[PDB]
Symmetry: D2
Subunit: 99 residues, 4 copies
């Protein structure tokens, strides 16, 4: 299953909060704003995320202007946060951190 | 100059309205939602736009989820719509239309 | 299986030859050069192919300079042309044709 | 001018050799192979380079398969290595090093 147990969810939220993600209050979704130096960096980062979204069949809701990228993750068919969201968030952290 | 004359602005708005763009009421900006078949198409389109944004040093405000891309254009330093916005919009129409 | 039957291979080669691909003589691989108007188009095309490569876990050998993209497809683990190569080639044709 | 003085060329070659580039013997061009962990990384890197190529109007000759990217730089109109090649190489080093 892609569903999180209560234990897995608790742990995922701790880990994601440590990584700077927040939970939305009105949706079962997580959110984070990334700020790069420029658009070259931001769009290079988006390109990596896009590749992974297609590998996983799991897609972000995201906004960009120049160096800023705002990302909301949730599992659109399920209506809830799942292991797919946690995995994509962890990949996004890796893609962002390298620059 | 990148500034539009009154005549050039009037004509640009007519052309952009014909292309499905709208003017925002609260900002001097234009807006359009694009709907593709899938994310592969949407992100391929975004990649072309990103390339052009760097060629022009002129960047969109944009939101994507899966096949949908929402774009707002304005010239951030100027506070107004300029020839840069018109040129980028026309390029975006070309990139979208080819699929 | 991803392997082609003799019938499926014969048919795939006919279809791919009609689409402008050639068979290499020294490898069980197919090859085609694409020529676009510019790099914006060529790299937009590459971005779509890259997305699909990650969706499929199947990667091209490719060369680009400006508007030209040369692609060789074969299944690297198998040493032969497979259904993965045919599927990716058909996707590449779609991505190229739209511009 | 984009042309290198003899002093600037000597210094550029030293710096680029330190960065792992080589001079081709038969062309006035420089060459380097990059090896990433995977295609996600390699294509994210290519996307950054593509953006910069359009910003600069200066394009690589490059080959990719999975995690490997081979790049040859020269100024196609000039027939020689120029400041554009040095600048793009330095950008490529930055894009590669971050991962």
């Amino acid at each position: 299953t892609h569903r999180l147990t209560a234990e897995e969810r608790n742990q995922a939220i701790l880990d994601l909060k440590a990584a700077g993600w927040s939970e939305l209050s009105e949706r079962d979704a997580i959110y984070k704003e990334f700020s790069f130096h420029n658009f070259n960096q931001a769009f290079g980062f988006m390109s990596r995320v896009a590749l992974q979204a297609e590998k996983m069949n799991h897609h972000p809701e995201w906004f960009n202007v120049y160096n800023k990228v705002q990302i909301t993750l949730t599992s659109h068919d399920c209506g809830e946060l799942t292991k797919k969201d946690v995995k994509l968030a962890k990949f996004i952290e890796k893609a962002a951190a390298s620059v």
